[PDB]
Amino acid sequence: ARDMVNPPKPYKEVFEEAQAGHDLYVVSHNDYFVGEAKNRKYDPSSFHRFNLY
Amino acid sequence: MRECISVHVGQAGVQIGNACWELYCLEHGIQPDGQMPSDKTIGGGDDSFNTFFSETGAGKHVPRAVFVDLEPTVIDEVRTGTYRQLFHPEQLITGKEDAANNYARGHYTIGKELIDLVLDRIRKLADQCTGLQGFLIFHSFGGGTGSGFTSLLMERLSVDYGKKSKLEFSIYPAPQVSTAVVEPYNSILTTHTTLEHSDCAFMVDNEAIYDICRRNLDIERPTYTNLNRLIGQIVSSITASLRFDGALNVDLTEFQTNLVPYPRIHFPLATYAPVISAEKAYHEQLSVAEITNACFEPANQMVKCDPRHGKYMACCLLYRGDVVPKDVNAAIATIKTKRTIQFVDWCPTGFKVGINYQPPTVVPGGDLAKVQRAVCMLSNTTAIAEAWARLDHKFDLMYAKRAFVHWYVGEGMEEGEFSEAREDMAALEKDYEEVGMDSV
Amino acid sequence: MRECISVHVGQAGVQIGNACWELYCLEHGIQPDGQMPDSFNTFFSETGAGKHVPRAVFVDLEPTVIDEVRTGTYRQLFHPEQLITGKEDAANNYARGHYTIGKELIDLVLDRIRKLADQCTGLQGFLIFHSFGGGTGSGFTSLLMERLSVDYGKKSKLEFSIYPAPQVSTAVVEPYNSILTTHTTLEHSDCAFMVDNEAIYDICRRNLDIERPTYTNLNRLIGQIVSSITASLRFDGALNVDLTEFQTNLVPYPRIHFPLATYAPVISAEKAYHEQLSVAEITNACFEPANQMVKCDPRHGKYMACCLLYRGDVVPKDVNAAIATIKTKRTIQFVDWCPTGFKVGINYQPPTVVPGGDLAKVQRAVCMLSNTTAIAEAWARLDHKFDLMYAKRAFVHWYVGEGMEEGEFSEAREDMAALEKDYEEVGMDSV
Amino acid sequence: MREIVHLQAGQCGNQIGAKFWEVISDEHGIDPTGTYHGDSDLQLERINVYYNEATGGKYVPRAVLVDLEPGTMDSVRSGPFGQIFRPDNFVFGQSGAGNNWAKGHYTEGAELVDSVLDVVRKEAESCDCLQGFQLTHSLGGGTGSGMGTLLISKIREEYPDRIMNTFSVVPSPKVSDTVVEPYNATLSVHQLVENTDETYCIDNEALYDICFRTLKLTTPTYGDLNHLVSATMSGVTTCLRFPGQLNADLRKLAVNMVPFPRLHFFMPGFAPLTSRGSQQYRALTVPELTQQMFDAKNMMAACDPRHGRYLTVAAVFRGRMSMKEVDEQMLNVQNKNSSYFVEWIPNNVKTAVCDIPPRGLKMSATFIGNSTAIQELFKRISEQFTAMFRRKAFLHWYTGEGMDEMEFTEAESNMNDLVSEYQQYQDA
Amino acid sequence: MREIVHLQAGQCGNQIGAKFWEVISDEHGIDPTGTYHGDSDLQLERINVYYNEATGGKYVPRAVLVDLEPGTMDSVRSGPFGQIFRPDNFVFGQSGAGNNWAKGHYTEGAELVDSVLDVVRKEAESCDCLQGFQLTHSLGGGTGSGMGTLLISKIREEYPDRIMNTFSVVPSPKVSDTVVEPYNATLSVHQLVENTDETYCIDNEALYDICFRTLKLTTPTYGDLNHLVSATMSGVTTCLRFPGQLNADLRKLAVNMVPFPRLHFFMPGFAPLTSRGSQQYRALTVPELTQQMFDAKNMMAACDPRHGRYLTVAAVFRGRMSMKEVDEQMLNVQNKNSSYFVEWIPNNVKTAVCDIPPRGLKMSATFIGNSTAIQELFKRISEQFTAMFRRKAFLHWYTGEGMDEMEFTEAESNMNDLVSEYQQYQDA
Ligand SMILES: Nc1nc2c(ncn2[C@@H]2O[C@H](COP(=O)(O)OP(=O)(O)OP(=O)(O)O)[C@@H](O)[C@H]2O)c(=O)[nH]1
């Protein structure tokens, strides 16, 4: 096919197929994102995202 | 009372200037469209918004800022974004060309067509207001619109108003890496006209704010929109002694005797101390006896050079929040006993505190956890002479063939500035240190 | 107030603290989320919210051993910046360790030293843990203490080891390591590291009847010793022992700073409650060669001084009865010019036992601490293992290829031979 | 309001200039009848960069199709998106010309040029803020790079600072598709180097080997390489029609790019291109795409980068990124590659990050480099004049109209004036 | 972190390379489509040692294949687990080396050894920090040994302090495979002693005799032998991937093992290997591994360690276990032999432990040892080179390519260097 430098994919399908690794990516490598933090697991009573701390 | 003008000229500071106006509207009940949201509607008892805003009688509040840049793209998303329902649509001046880094494309060829319009608005705002205190001009040091085009709009207010203050909030050029290629040459352009007018600045770069994002923040590889919020916070801490009252509050006229020893050393640092996420704030207590030191850590200050080769001259620990003033001199007498924080020998005056009673202001949509305490650190230090030592030297190795001058001489600019400003830039770097070790 | 700051170094030393900070945490009412489901201030900082955080810095250059701490069940305890990890292994090579590999991590590990100790009121020690075999258990700590002697001075540093057994060990290159972590850290060191673990294996066979222990099962007992030393800091006794007090007591001369340890009432769960563990029984149960945590023969050495430390329900007329039991008894040799012999220690609080362990809830306990005149004898043949390697200059090119001079070993050996002969000088009688 | 006036000329530029409008119209939602079909908002609000608007709610380009021989313009009128244009500016004639520079600027192109430039005059004098020109030609023949100098000479006589943006296909080393090619290519260097500011130089040979190695295409026809050139066409125009975080027009992409008034020639390149087989096997990042930008194979003009030092690399990024990753990973390519950049410039790179990328992948890119190493392209063509000129080969056509040998000797030095200055500034 | 980059070479290399990536892939739970479909949690966090990620959660191995005959390349891809390597990494030559490295590295492979660094230098700068390399070959052939002496050599120039770990299969005592083997193993030592940090020696009759008596296996082809070398393959490398009480990676062995740096060849083995029929009847304990590991049946070299003395020995005991049983079993074998352990190293014996077994056994162990009488492996190769090179029996096929006569004696003295240094250190 002459056109693979601009393959025929919509924006929503492109985003949904590209965000393919749910949790495996950040565990198995440093899966960087533009402006995203790291979320270590925490107990239910202990750590709220923003409370009196 | 106690009002100030906030013009956002040049692309770098107008986009950080897009980031401050979320933060002010969150503190009070002002929505983006200016209506208090059908409850908590004030009768009119308080006047807390008067430092940065103003009132139209329908209930909508009106800000005080002006968005000018000749670029057409970057102002066009504040006429269509989430904040179009905020400003006054005569404040917004757009145009046709960018900087293209040419000094006459912000001062002789294109910036000369727009100067009656932009002067007739800073005087339009000021006649409505009662008693003025200073200016909040958001310009970086790189381009012909960041650094060429602030010198045109600084040189006309200072013959209009005379004795008003000046404050600035943007990005210093890093010594090692940058984006615009003519930036070694570029900053020295603004220093020929804006050293006898400018009384405030920014010391250091956006390079080191990446690394605070690495360590103290738990984020990995940030954008530029994280830059805009953290620079946007210290705007609301310097200007917090103008509408929020505490123990020791400073208006913006006192800083021209606090921080300017001789007529050519007039710039601060900026350091928000507890810049941490939830995952570390939960583990650690952050009292006054360490957030004073957290400001003086070699990591947390914003500097891309060694602080350990620097001698702090005039610090100003502007506190904020739930603080008690015995904790302060317990912390400062801790500091001046520490041998590593070397000072200036012939000024034991040095410190200058400011205490207030509002918390740190969070904005939703960020990394931050809520902390009860925070503190700014405007600090005039010694070590930054090394950073001006390389920047005019960055001019000096393309100085042989005079690369890139073919567009300055091409469009409206002469060669005559390029030697006189350098020796004047050499005059600026020698004058920290020709007084730096005299009285021994 | 009367605190310490603990830094666990190396894979042989971080793995000490994983079972040690099990023990200190359960000895208070602290769940590792930090919340209880003022006397504990000797070790913990407290937030405004009510979170407990220990005074710990975890340092190693192999990222595996620290990573199990971070993802296990104690993730909610540590500030996750206290865990300091390398990215390449020290590889049993202090020419790699304290010359090349540790030279870039050394800024972070000192900036945590000051910041944990900028909070605290008034200190009297540090707690440092490694073996004598690994490179980062030999060299990095020398880098991690010579800057500590300069930056602190007189404030003490205390150390605890599990030396791998000199008769049968892991590495061929281990005598190259245990000489230079005794040589270079001789001048700085206060009350310091211990003897080997083969006696811990044997006492895990006869007195502890269960066969086949693991490093997890030994580290149950190693934390039992250390907490008895810091038992009086959290809880009052009718005799209280400060921790600076151990410098002046068990050190005869300031090139001899290795006073050993053992813990006498170790008993299996079946044999625990048929018998008395009386005050006179357990002190008589310290001074035999069989019951020691020390795999050297005490018959070779006249004892200089000893330190006894009772935990629980002890009446000191029995201690005076137990001290009178040993001196007049003929086999043991308290040394000729020292008639003092003993440092006493009592404490009311019972010895805590971790659930799931092989130990016993005993009413009384003692941690027998001593210095013997046979410590040079293990130091004698250790340099013989160092003699037999370095005669044909074997394995040296995996150190002298890395920034360290060729004749540095023979400086240390004759210095250690300056320690062996001058140690034997005090051992003779003086008429 | 960073505008561009378009033209086509020669057979080679007519096709890629026609295959320009296939790529840009898909970005912006336009249907060949002229109905806006795109669902996204941002396609419209800077559409007047390349387009007039047609009355009745319809859209229309801004270009002038011209060449002397009428087969090509009649070929595109029957083409895929032929029915978009305006029929008054097709200046096509049935007559021909035999690839001679002489007649096309003195006799046969003199009758045509007033009708040619009165519609470049039409679309410009009713404009708001004109900023540039875009003429797609090719270096070889007497019609392509003959007429490239015709359609630029009378322009600069009035426009003071407007920045022309042409695109030229170079002669390949190994093969030839015209015998009289050095005898006409250097004829345009007498005027183009004086006046052009962007010439995206393209080799035909390097276009095949990208298809052979990366794309694994055995057979790259002409439906391929135009669609490969067309990406760097609409990749430089991202900060002319779209929002972005680091914006620059064609002038700022000349003040940064141009150091001295005659070294201004651009090398194309498109990063996230891969064959179909190994596309799943490859995961892209900002570190991964920066390899394909800085790879030795992803350059449309064949030269050796390891025989020259880059003056000003300017790679434009498009999409949603981290911008430490933009700046930290465009220094790591400069630190690790030390001696192959000029020592008299401290920072040799410049990024440009956009907010909506061109369609086809999430994270697109386009890399534009201004090396020094393209002097080996200049050495061979300037040699091919003079070692063929020791016998006075083909002058008996061009001297019917007054192309004297006093001209063809001195224009060869104006090629070698360019060679002497890279040697002046490689060792500096 | 401590990441390793793979290589393969020749006919033996692609066969033992493809079976290794059948082993270590199924250790992590990766199907041949490449996507992690396993249920465990301890496999992902250190899979970055040997695996890049293909986007979509597919895991691509950090491997690269090369042979000078492209048929042996494409046997791998059609196989069971050949669909995981990216096809851009299948570098190759087009004409066979013909058991001549005068051809394999001097003349034929020289155009290829230039280009195959580009796959090597790009898979091995995509790591944060580097620890080593791996390549599997044999010392009799021409395609995978002479190129194996050139793939090592260019690496040492640009990674001068990284621990290469190259795996060998040594020519046989009695049943030779090619006629020209003394012209190979005597000459593939000149560029293997001097520039390789880790090498293992494997004989094929030792691989047969372990399949003759202890296995009692009836008709196995080259299939299960390719597991047998793969059983001790990652047994060294397991402490990189999984936690343990007492860890030992490559640089802990490399410090410990080699006494003097011109002696880096080793005898591997594998401990819990029991017969198929009598698998049920044998309980497995920690001491029962040790006796099965130090007898001369599980040695994987056809040169007897009973006739010599060990220098340094380690063993790692993978799986959950107690470790008093490590100690006095290593005491047991150290004092069971006095003559077999040298005078001037008191403790000749090293240990290690991991907490995770191979997927298929309860608890396993491997062997490594450095024996004296492996100089009889060195003598026997050197003896069969004195016979052929006195009458110049096969010189002229290698001579005319560009390897003159003196280059076979220089590698012969260096080969007689290596037999000399074992005899002087043996008697002690
Ligand atoms: N915080 C922040 N900084 C930015 C952003 N965009 C650009 N910058 C900074 O702006 C600098 C560019 O130099 P400038 O002085 O702004 O150039 P300019 O005057 O805007 O020139 P023109 O873009 O042509 O108008 C870069 O070095 C960036 O650090 C942004 O979106 N957010």
Ligand SMILES: Nc1nc2c(ncn2[C@@H]2O[C@H](COP(=O)(O)OP(=O)(O)OP(=O)(O)O)[C@@H](O)[C@H]2O)c(=O)[nH]1
């Ligand atoms: N009781 C106990 N002893 C241990 C443990 N881990 C290591 N050791 C002792 O440490 C000895 C080996 O430790 P080292 O030689 O320092 O190895 P390392 O800790 O990895 O040091 P490096 O290799 O330099 O990183 C063993 O023989 C043990 O006696 C443990 O978890 N518990």
Ligand SMILES: Nc1nc2c(ncn2[C@@H]2O[C@H](COP(=O)(O)OP(=O)(O)O)[C@@H](O)[C@H]2O)c(=O)[nH]1
């Ligand atoms: N990519 C591409 N190149 C072409 C096409 N047609 C001609 N060319 C190139 O044009 C070159 C010849 O010079 P040319 O452009 O014809 O000079 P002209 O006659 O004045 O147009 C040849 O080397 C061709 O490669 C086309 O459709 N596509």
Ligand SMILES: Nc1nc2c(ncn2[C@@H]2O[C@H](COP(=O)(O)OP(=O)(O)O)[C@@H](O)[C@H]2O)c(=O)[nH]1
């Ligand atoms: N373990 C193993 N060894 C093999 C296999 N196939 C061939 N070999 C070895 O390969 C050797 C022949 O060398 P070869 O690889 O053909 O040399 P080349 O022709 O240069 O590649 C023989 O001695 C075999 O022992 C296999 O499937 N498994």
Ligand SMILES: [Mg+2]
């Ligand atoms: Mg701008």
Ligand SMILES: [Mg+2]
């Ligand atoms: Mg280790």
